[PDB]
């Protein structure tokens with residue numbers, strides 16, 4: 001099971017870890033991807049998770065979009081976890097760099113409540129442009145299920161823990 005996590009609350013845990021390496025190690029029931037509405041896994045967490053699947057995540061995602069159309073900002077879909085997890089929950093947090101409404105971050109985290117346990121990144125953090133400290137606060141105030149947050153950047157992880 002999950003090892004080395006700092007317990008933030010009753011249900012939120014955090015670790016300075018590479019989410020791809022973490023997923024390969026734990027093989028969780030659910031790994032969350034920091035997805036965009038088109039499921040184009042080009043960079044950040046999505047680019048790293050997709051590269052770990054040898055592009056199988058992108059091939060599956062393109063078929064999903066061809067059938068269903070784009071996701072909503074704040075929405076999600078459950079697809080295969082490939083070699084990383086049983087399932088991948090692709091969650092679209094607002095991208096502040098695209099001028100998307102930061103208020104949608106709570107809706108994005110609500111998707112986590114449909115899964116009893118998840119390995120996840122901080123939604124809208126990194127290349128999505130939101131403040132990761134704010135993302136962690138929305139996570140702990142929205143998610144009620146057991147979430148294991150992986151924060152790649154050590155300096156950001158320390159800042160998140162020290163300011164919690």
Ligand SMILES: NC(=O)[C@H]1CCCn2ccnc21
Pocket residue numbers: 018019020043044045046048126152153
């Ligand atoms: N893209 C991210 O935020 C994480 C994803 C796992 C690997 N990794 C390397 C650099 N940063 C990361």
